[PDB]
């Protein structure tokens, strides 16, 4: 079901086996490098492997998560096959100016699992140039890049916020407003797994 869907939850405790399989996963984790972070072990233990059979993972990283994110990516069963960088500009397309250099960019690892078929690889390039909006707010261009890569398929975003909800996406995060599910398969499995509407441990 095409329109945006979301689940307010602690991603550490949600049974994500109820959500089905996804063409694309994206995560912007609160790495342990205001909000609740996850320890390195909690990150490794995330049940990302159940979310896909064949498709792509987009994993935002910074600082030492550049290495930890690669570890997680490989542990969860992905091979890193691209690395998008977002060049941060102001409204006049100047670069907004790690203790050795000033940081002009953010990194999103791209992992592949299985053998995805029917994706439109090569349509976009691996550099985003876009204005910094709010704090820790990722650029909206990533959604269009992902939509051209895999149009119309099911997608899931981990550690998203209300501004991240998108058609074709299910968004998970603990600052979302309740539970809003429209896909009938997901609704059925959610009721069965959570009959009283509560996610505990």
């Amino acid at each position: 079901l095409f329109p945006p869907q979301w689940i307010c939850c602690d991603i550490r405790y949600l049974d994500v086996s109820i959500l089905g399989k996804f063409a694309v996963v994206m995560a912007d984790p609160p790495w342990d490098i205001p909000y609740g972070t996850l320890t390195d072990d909690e990150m490794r233990r995330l049940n990302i492997p159940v979310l896909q059979d064949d498709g792509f993972l987009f994993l935002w990283v910074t600082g030492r998560a550049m290495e930890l994110g690669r570890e997680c990516l490989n542990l969860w069963g992905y091979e890193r096959v691209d690395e998008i960088i977002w060049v941060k500009t102001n409204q006049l397309q100047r670069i907004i100016r790690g203790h050795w250099l000033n940081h002009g960019k953010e990194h999103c690892l791209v992992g592949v699992k299985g053998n995805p078929q029917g994706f439109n690889q090569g349509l976009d390039c691996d550099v985003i140039v876009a204005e910094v909006r709010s704090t820790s707010h990722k650029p909206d261009e990533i959604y269009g890049m992902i939509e051209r890569l895999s149009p119309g398929t099911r997608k899931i975003e981990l550690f998203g916020r209300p501004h991240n909800v998108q058609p074709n996406w299910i968004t998970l995060g603990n600052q979302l407003d309740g539970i809003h599910l429209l896909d009938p398969d997901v609704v059925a499995r959610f009721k069965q797994r959570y009959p009283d509407g509560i996610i505990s441990k």
């Binding site: 690395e83 960088i85 000033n102």
Partner: protein, 244 residues
């Protein structure tokens, strides 16, 4: 404006629209501090790297990867990882490793840890295509996106600039990296023993020892080189006045 959509529409990469893309006394002190350029033709595969002395404060490592020769002796990450870089690096020192845009972003990190470094910066060379927007890109089999950048990883071991370099994509068959990487490195004021492995006649530079297979001439002499750093000059940053 969505420059990603625009690139899909026109072939102009989003970095084409970045604009604008005194720390000059430091550049002057660097220039006064620099040793004479030194260089050595050496087949690094067959060469005992331990003959390069003394131990270096900075190593710039630029192995010729196969991916550099798209439409054109290449070094695999197997070869590169077996270089004994830790045997010539000083206990406190820095490495700058050109990793390309594919599996090197992972294997280059394996190399850095293997040699005893931790990664502290990831410097991205972003390539514009302002002069040739139409010319598309033949993709790596595993690629999901068109690759328009290369990464230079900075590693540290022991106790003004941005992490981006933006230039026009060079002509096919041109493997040179932007000389701006030398500016970034020298502005760090890391010490004066600087080694560029797999450099060429075209990259030879004051303040650097360049070692590489295609060099046409050599002037390297280990004793002469060491004399540039004997007391009272053992510990200069390369960013201070000469010792009278």
């Amino acid at each position: 404006n969505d420059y990603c959509q625009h690139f899909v529409d026109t072939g102009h990469r989003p970095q084409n629209f970045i604009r604008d893309v005194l720390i000059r006394l430091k550049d002057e002190l660097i220039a006064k501090s620099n040793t004479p350029p030194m260089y050595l033709q050496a087949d690094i595969e067959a060469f005992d790297i331990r003959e390069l002395t003394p131990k270096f404060d900075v190593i710039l490592l630029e192995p010729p990867l196969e991916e550099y020769y798209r439409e054109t002796k290449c070094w695999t990450w197997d070869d590169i990882m077996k270089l004994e870089i830790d045997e010539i690096a000083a206990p406190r020192s820095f490495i700058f490793l050109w990793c390309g845009s594919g599996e090197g972003l992972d294997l280059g990190r394996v190399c850095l840890r293997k040699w005893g470094y931790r990664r502290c910066e990831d410097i991205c060379w972003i390539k514009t295509n302002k002069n040739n927007p139409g010319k598309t890109k033949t993709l790596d089999p595993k690629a999901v996106f068109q690759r328009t950048k290369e990464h230079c990883l900075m590693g540290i071991k022991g106790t003004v600039d941005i992490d981006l370099i933006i230039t026009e994509e060079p002509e096919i068959g041109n493997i040179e990296k932007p000389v701006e990487i030398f500016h970034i490195i020298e502005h760090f004021c890391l010490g004066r023993r600087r080694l560029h492995l797999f450099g060429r006649d075209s990259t030879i530079r004051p303040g650097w020892l360049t070692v590489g297979p295609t060099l046409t001439n050599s002037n390297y002499n280990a004793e002469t080189y060491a004399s540039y750093f004997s007391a009272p000059n053992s510990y200069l940053t390369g960013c201070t006045e000469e010792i009278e």
